Amino acid sequence: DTSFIDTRKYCTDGLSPREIQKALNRQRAYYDRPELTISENKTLLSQSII
Amino acid sequence: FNFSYDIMTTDGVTRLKEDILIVTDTGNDIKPIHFYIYFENRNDKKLRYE
Amino acid sequence: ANRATSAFLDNPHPVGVNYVDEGSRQFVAVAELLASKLIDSSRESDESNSDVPFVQAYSKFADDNPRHLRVKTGGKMANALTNVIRSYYSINAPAIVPQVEIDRLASKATVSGDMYNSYAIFNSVPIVEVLSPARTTVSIVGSDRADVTMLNTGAGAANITFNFGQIAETVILKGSVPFQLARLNQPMPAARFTYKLRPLDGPFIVVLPVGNPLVISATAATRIQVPLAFNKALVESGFQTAMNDGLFDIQNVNYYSSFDEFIISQYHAQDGINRVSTCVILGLALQAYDQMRRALPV
Amino acid sequence: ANRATSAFLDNPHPVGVNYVDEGSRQFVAVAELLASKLIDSSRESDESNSDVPFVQAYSKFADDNPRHLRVKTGGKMANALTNVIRSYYSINAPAIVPQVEIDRLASKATVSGDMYNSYAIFNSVPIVEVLSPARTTVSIVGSDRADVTMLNTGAGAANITFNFGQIAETVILKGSVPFQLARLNQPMPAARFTYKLRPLDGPFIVVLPVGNPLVISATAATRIQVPLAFNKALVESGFQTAMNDGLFDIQNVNYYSSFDEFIISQYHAQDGINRVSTCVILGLALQAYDQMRRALPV
Amino acid sequence: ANRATSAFLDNPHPVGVNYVDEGSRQFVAVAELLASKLIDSSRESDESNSDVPFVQAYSKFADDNPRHLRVKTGGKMANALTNVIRSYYSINAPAIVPQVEIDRLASKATVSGDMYNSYAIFNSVPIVEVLSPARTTVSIVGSDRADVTMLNTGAGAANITFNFGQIAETVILKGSVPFQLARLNQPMPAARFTYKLRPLDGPFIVVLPVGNPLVISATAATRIQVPLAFNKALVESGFQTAMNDGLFDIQNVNYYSSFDEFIISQYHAQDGINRVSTCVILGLALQAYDQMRRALPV
Amino acid sequence: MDVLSKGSLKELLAHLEKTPLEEAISYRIGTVPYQNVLISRNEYYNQLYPDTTSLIDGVSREGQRNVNGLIMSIISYVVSGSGHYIPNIGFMLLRRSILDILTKHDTGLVTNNLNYGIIARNLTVSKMNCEQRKRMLICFKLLAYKDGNQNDYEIYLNQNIPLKQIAPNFIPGDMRTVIHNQDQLAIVGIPAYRLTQSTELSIRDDNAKSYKLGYVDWYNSNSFLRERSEFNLIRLKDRDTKYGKLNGW
């Protein structure tokens, strides 16, 4: 990642966490809930690691 | 924080070249800082208004 | 006539009247939520062979980046949480923390702050008074389970009056030997081991025969409205940590063995309805203290 | 003078000195992690129509595929954990498991073997000694809550000395009737129901009048460094199980009602600081034994 | 029952309550770092025959380039450091320096203001009290090495009680002749030359024979949390220069021979934990004072 | 030297199988074991350097003619590289291997009365290092299994806490336990640190460094066997094999 704190290695194999994030945000749009926050996005985008 | 500035001999409105903040889903960042510094005449009403 | 009462019910000290507003109650809820993230992030960081998840969780909690050559005290949130805990316990404790800092720390999360959306059951046994005549001895020992030993030295049967208060919901009485118990102006039933009582029914009379002493074991249950995040196991652990750390060390206060004893004692005092509202907020704050201190020992 | 002491504090037996290295501590932590996943995978498979999550979890834990007609025992990890638990309890127990098996099983998961990143509170009351004069009777009953019943049949008041050791941090004293307690060679305060005492302060003198029996209830809190994964509820159930399947049956050892009593008793020995480190590793191993055996009963 | 106590433990005066915040702690740490470079540049300049390293070091410290016809005072930083040391010693000393000047000076260098990174061992012996009976004479001399001379003129052997407090970690007792020492109400051992004791173990009894004087030599070690840059040799030199310069001269303050005695005395007073924190900041400030004064002799 | 180079349990037991008892016994008179003596260490001091001689030195000493001396000579050979002076033992006993004496009843030697505590004290277990104590414990376990004294061996370990922690894990009758064992038992070897041609103060340390420096010379000598370059020239009987089993194990 571009963040200086994050030294983790983000795996590119498997289903992309970005695809789940896009699907989850569309679900929240239907229910009129606010979109995923930055903290929630970072946790979801860092699920796949090496 | 990296900053650059140009000092102009003429009078004018001191400002920044770019807007301060950029917001992304990943996080919030600060755009590059560049100053346009001018010398001041206190009795110039037009530049005081701006 | 002799009077015997539970030790923990004697002279409850007044509780604090500060940090009870809506914004302050949100800060306690935020602190509990963020402290629980610290513990989970520590266990996540151990399995992933990285310290990043703990670093981000600590940065959210303490508003400062961890450094290898600096102590991890917990930041401004840890200091504010410690001071509000002191203020709740006693009305004499100063309210050091300003209101602006409380509001800034409450903006980290989006919790509601409601303290009445759930319930918890407390097991402290309230025995307000035990009335015994002359020539009989009565002793009460215990809080979670109260054992009352009554001995009759005289030549006739003695009647002992039991008053469990009006707050407790149910009280279960078990005797070493079968005994007789009935309410005011009611016929005595046959002797039996176990009685289920409602404290609001009224004072109860136990027939005490002459001979070997009779011991009655009392267990009680009380319902108190608590937040959904309330966890009695964490609250009790946080209570002991706060007492050992000296957060409760202040003049003109009464100390208790457990948070269960503390909340029941205040609830049985006058204006105790308003007191338990403050005690419940203290309990949630103690939950945050236990989780934060276990993740960041000092 | 008559001396009375707590029963569980008498003669702690020496603990084992094996499997206390960093490689063996990693294996205990790995077993706890894999046992936790075994419980979770079984519940997920129960609530689904597929057994794949349980097959994968058991295969990693037991190094063998489950079979329908064969008992699921846990394989080599179960055998290693059972024998390692035996060694920790007593020095007389042999060290059967080779180091190669321990190192290989520790490689199944990635967890640090740190055993000092957190703390826990233990509730045993360490009454080392109670010294009473002649014509007085003192009886000590209980471990989690210690009740001392004292009677004075003498002509005058008697001074009783209470020693709570130097390990416990806070002791809370509650009495049936108000009583006087002060440190040695200090003026005696007014009679009151409750006392908060630091055991480091010194031996405590209690004035016992000649009128009626006085019962003092004691509760103590002591802090011991434990790994973050420590869960007191799971350890206590694991302690009760391991005693039932005979894992603690070995010559010339003591038996305790709870793990809280076991760890506090060893802490108060001459080498208590060295003993608690081994007992902490035993507690985590008991935590893994509880989860593993509940998922795979044999 | 005569009572004898150490001279330096008597009546520690209150310490200053200013310049102890996080911003002020950074100022002291920054001054120490900049003063250390000032003393290193002066040594380099003498050997290298070029004054460029010193000119750069002085410009950073004093914000003004050195001049040949002007005195090398040290600038605003030197004046600020001198006055902050005055405030630390006593609560009666005025706080001249404004917070704005402290913040401006602290921005010159970036250094963590943490004062709990490391530890230092202090060698003052805290003999709080020595209780002796009639017909015995006891004299205590010394702070670094406490020399207790006892002479018994009575008919039988006497018991002398030693109290070393609860702050010191270890105390080693050496006698001119073998002697007997045991804890309170504990069996006496055989006579021996050397005793290693833990002050928290309790007051100790010494059996004093009749006829020949017995001199007990006491040495102590105490651990106090200090910043990693703390150097005891430089702090002691700064302490004596500070006293000779006269900035410790305030009404109703106690004077001590060394910083070791000053910090132990404040530790043993009431609220000693809070006093020690200010003393550590004073020690680091005195360390910068010694280095800056030696580089620039004014 | 060769016995001190073995670093695994499999190699140590394999060497003992092929080594007769006469290698453990020394035919040099030596000196009496426990004496306070003054030795010369001119690299460090001008005055004579006090020391106490012992049985685990690298130099032969005089030994008692009883069975206790024979076992004590075997252990000293394993841990120090040299044995003691016990002559006229006999051809029948001397031709047997060291493992046969320690593990087999057919040798004709009776050792069930031996006391492990007295043997350890006479061998100065306090002066032994970690590898030396592990090697001696291997000898004790083999003797216990021969005499059916397994329970006594375990109790002796319980009395001595440091010995229990370092006790090697192997069943003296099963070869599968020996292969799995990963304890490092080497006393001499190729040194990772800087090893210099300098003397040591004590007799034990100076004699140990002689073997360490001798092993380096032995390693580069023509007598050393290089498995990587000359494996085909080794005889098949003594060639290294993965499925290597001691007889009866």
Q: Which residue is closest to D97 within chain F, CA to CA? A: F169
Amino acid identity at D95: A
Distance from C-alpha of C150 to C-alpha of C140, rounded to nearest angstrom: 9
Token pair belonging to F54:
């012992």
Q: Judging by beta carbons within 10 Å of its beta carbon (0-12, 13-18, 19+), is residue F232 exposed, middle or buried? A: exposed
Chain D residues closer than 8 Å to F167 by CB: 95
SS3 E217: strand
Q: Which residue is closest to C67 within chain E, CA to CA? A: E112
- Asked whether the beta carbons of C6 and C127 are under 8 A apart, the reply is yes
Token pair belonging to D253:
């050892």
Q: Which residue is closest to D229 within chain C, CA to CA? A: C43
Experimental method: cryo-EM
Chain D residues closer than 8 Å to F161 by CB: 17, 91
- Asked whether the beta carbons of D271 and D258 are under 8 A apart, the reply is no
- Nearest-CA distance A12 → chain B (Å): 18
Q: Which residue is closest to D227 within chain C, CA to CA? A: C294
Distance from C-alpha of C124 to C-alpha of C165, rounded to nearest angstrom: 12
Residue identified by tokens 């099963």 is: F174
- Nearest-CA distance C252 → chain A (Å): 45
Distance from C-alpha of D224 to C-alpha of D235, rounded to nearest angstrom: 14
Q: Say whether residue E117 is in contact with chain C using an 8 A CB cutoff.
A: yes
Residues 6+ apart with CB under 8 A from F190: F216, F219
Chain B residues closer than 8 Å to A38 by CB: 25-28
CB contact under 8 A, C52 and A7: yes
Distance from C-alpha of F222 to C-alpha of F229, rounded to nearest angstrom: 13
Chain pair A-B, CB pairs under 8 angstroms: 12
Distance from C-alpha of D92 to C-alpha of D251, rounded to nearest angstrom: 8
CB contact under 8 A, D94 and F154: yes
Phi, psi of F47 (to 5 degrees): -75, 165
Please state whether beta strands C170-183 and C158-163 pair in parallel, antiparallel, or not at all (unpaired): unpaired
Please state whether beta strands E129-132 and F36-39 pair in parallel, antiparallel, or not at all (unpaired): unpaired
Distance from C-alpha of C248 to C-alpha of C230, rounded to nearest angstrom: 21
Chain D residues closer than 8 Å to F181 by CB: 98, 100
Distance from C-alpha of F23 to C-alpha of F97, rounded to nearest angstrom: 9
Q: Say whether residue E273 is in contact with chain C using an 8 A CB cutoff.
A: no
Please state whether beta strands C192-197 and C170-183 pair in parallel, antiparallel, or not at all (unpaired): antiparallel
Q: Which residue is closest to C76 within chain E, CA to CA? A: E22
- Nearest-CA distance D276 → chain E (Å): 20
Amino acid identity at E204: F
DSSP string, chain C: -EEE--GGGS-PPPPP-SS-SHHHHHHHHHHHHHHHHHHHHHHHHHHTT-SHHHHHHHHHHHSS---TTS----HHHHHHHHHHHHHHH-TTS---S-HHHHHHHHTSS-----S-SEEEEE------EEEE-TTEEEEEE-SSSEEEEEEE-SSS-EEEEEE--SS-SEEEEEEEEEEEEEETT------EEEEEE-GGG--EEEEE-SSS-EEEEEEEEEEEEE-TT--HHHHHHHHHHHHHTTTT--SS----SSHHHHHHHHHHSTTHHHHHHHHHHHHHHHHHHHHHHHHS--
Chains F and E make contact, 3+ CB pairs within 8 Å = no
> Which H or E element spans position D183?
strand D170-183
Please state whether beta strands F84-85 and C118-122 pair in parallel, antiparallel, or not at all (unpaired): unpaired
Chain C residues closer than 8 Å to D174 by CB: 7-8, 143, 257
Neighbours of D20 (CB within 10 A): 18
Return the C-alpha torsion angle F123, F127, F130, F135, nearest 10.
-10
- Nearest-CA distance A38 → chain B (Å): 5
Helices (H), chain F: 2-5, 9-18, 67-80, 91-94, 98-103, 116-122, 130-147, 150-159, 161-165, 175-180, 203-220, 227-230
Distance from C-alpha of C27 to C-alpha of C81, rounded to nearest angstrom: 9
Chain A contact partners (≥3 CB pairs within 8 A): B, C
- Nearest-CA distance C67 → chain A (Å): 12
- List the one residue out of D90, D69, D75 whose CA is nearest residue D34: D75
Residues 6+ apart with CB under 8 A from F208: F58, F187, F200
- Asked whether the beta carbons of F247 and F106 are under 8 A apart, the reply is no
Chain D residues closer than 8 Å to E203 by CB: 202
Distance from C-alpha of D281 to C-alpha of D259, rounded to nearest angstrom: 12
Chain D residues closer than 8 Å to C256 by CB: 172, 194
Distance from C-alpha of E221 to C-alpha of E168, rounded to nearest angstrom: 6
CB contact under 8 A, A8 and C48: yes
Return the C-alpha torsion angle C81, C83, C87, C92, nearest 10.
170
- List the one residue out of E212, E199, E224, E47 whose CA is nearest residue E118: E224
- Nearest-CA distance E114 → chain C (Å): 6
Phi, psi of E167 (to 5 degrees): -90, -45
Q: Alpha-carbon torsion C244, C249, C255, C259, what sign?
A: negative
Q: Judging by beta carbons within 10 Å of its beta carbon (0-12, 13-18, 19+), is residue C293 exposed, middle or buried? A: buried
Distance from C-alpha of D200 to C-alpha of D219, rounded to nearest angstrom: 16
Phi, psi of C153 (to 5 degrees): -95, -15
CB contact under 8 A, A49 and C48: yes
- Asked whether the beta carbons of E13 and E254 are under 8 A apart, the reply is yes
- Asked whether the beta carbons of F54 and F34 are under 8 A apart, the reply is yes
Phi, psi of D260 (to 5 degrees): -60, -45
Neighbours of F10 (CB within 10 A): 17
Distance from C-alpha of E257 to C-alpha of E243, rounded to nearest angstrom: 10
- List the one residue out of F100, F85, F99, F97 whose CA is nearest residue F30: F85
Chain F contact partners (≥3 CB pairs within 8 A): D
Distance from C-alpha of F96 to C-alpha of F21, rounded to nearest angstrom: 6
What's the N-to-C CA distance of chain F in angstroms?
A: 27
Token pair belonging to D76:
């080599």
Helix-helix angle D259-267:D272-295, to 10 degrees: 160
Distance from C-alpha of C45 to C-alpha of B50, rounded to nearest angstrom: 53
- List the one residue out of E182, E180, E167, E134 whose CA is nearest residue E3: E134
- Nearest-CA distance D253 → chain F (Å): 14
Neighbours of E222 (CB within 10 A): 24
Phi, psi of C53 (to 5 degrees): -60, -35
SS3 F46: coil
SS3 F225: coil
Neighbours of E41 (CB within 10 A): 22
Chain F residues closer than 8 Å to D92 by CB: 158
SS3 F232: coil
Neighbours of D123 (CB within 10 A): 21
Helices (H), F1-115: 2-5, 9-18, 67-80, 91-94, 98-103
Chain A residues closer than 8 Å to C56 by CB: 5, 42
- Asked whether the beta carbons of C285 and C31 are under 8 A apart, the reply is yes
Distance from C-alpha of F129 to C-alpha of F8, rounded to nearest angstrom: 17
> Hey, which residues does C122 pair with through a beta bridge?
C222
Q: Say whether residue D108 is in contact with chain C using an 8 A CB cutoff.
A: no
Return the C-alpha torsion angle F235, F241, F245, F246, nearest 10.
40
| DSSP label at residue F20 | B
Q: What angle do CA C125, C128, C131 make, to 5 degrees?
A: 120
Distance from C-alpha of C46 to C-alpha of F245, rounded to nearest angstrom: 43
Q: Which of C71, C249, C296, C298 to mutate to test the interface with E (most CBs of E within 10 A)?
A: C71
- List the one residue out of D115, D165, D119 whose CA is nearest residue D8: D165
Please state whether beta strands F61-62 and F84-85 pair in parallel, antiparallel, or not at all (unpaired): parallel
- Asked whether the beta carbons of D118 and D230 are under 8 A apart, the reply is yes
Token pair belonging to C95:
């309210």
Q: Judging by beta carbons within 10 Å of its beta carbon (0-12, 13-18, 19+), is residue E79 exposed, middle or buried? A: middle
- List the one residue out of D28, D132, D14, D139 whose CA is nearest residue D85: D28
Distance from C-alpha of F13 to C-alpha of E253, rounded to nearest angstrom: 77
Helices (H), F33-149: 67-80, 91-94, 98-103, 116-122, 130-147
Backbone discontinuities in chain F, residue before each (C to N > 2.5 A): none
- Nearest-CA distance E12 → chain C (Å): 24
Chain A residues closer than 8 Å to B27 by CB: 3, 38
Distance from C-alpha of D279 to C-alpha of D16, rounded to nearest angstrom: 9
- Asked whether the beta carbons of C281 and C88 are under 8 A apart, the reply is yes
- List the one residue out of F245, F243, F207 whose CA is nearest residue F76: F207
Residue identified by tokens 């500035």 is: B5
Q: Which of D87, D92, D97 to mutate to test the interface with F (most CBs of F within 10 A)?
A: D92
Phi, psi of D107 (to 5 degrees): -85, 0
- List the one residue out of E142, E46, E77, E104 whose CA is nearest residue E285: E77
Amino acid identity at D20: V
Note which residues in 199-218 of chain D have CB less than 8 A from chain E: 200, 202-203
Distance from C-alpha of C133 to C-alpha of C147, rounded to nearest angstrom: 19
Q: Judging by beta carbons within 10 Å of its beta carbon (0-12, 13-18, 19+), is residue E234 exposed, middle or buried? A: buried
- Asked whether the beta carbons of F140 and F153 are under 8 A apart, the reply is yes
Residue identified by tokens 């018994």 is: E152
Q: Please state the length of chain D.
A: 298
C-alpha distance from residue D257 to each of D120, D243, D265, D287 (Å): 19, 10, 11, 17
> Which H or E element spans position D101?
helix D99-106
Token pair belonging to F96:
């047997």
Distance from C-alpha of C242 to C-alpha of C287, rounded to nearest angstrom: 10
Q: Which residue is closest to B23 within chain A, CA to CA? A: A38
C-alpha distance from residue E203 to each of D202, E128, E162 (Å): 9, 10, 6
CB contact under 8 A, D118 and C7: no
Q: Say whether residue C67 is in contact with chain E using an 8 A CB cutoff.
A: yes
Pick from D17, D92, D98: CB nearest F169: D98
- Asked whether the beta carbons of F17 and F6 are under 8 A apart, the reply is no
Phi, psi of E148 (to 5 degrees): -105, 115
SS3 F81: coil
Q: Say whether residue E191 is in contact with chain D using an 8 A CB cutoff.
A: no
Resolution (Å) of this entry: 2.6
Q: Say whether residue D121 is in contact with chain C using an 8 A CB cutoff.
A: yes
Q: Which residue is closest to A47 within chain C, CA to CA? A: C48
- Nearest-CA distance C70 → chain E (Å): 6
Neighbours of D3 (CB within 10 A): 12
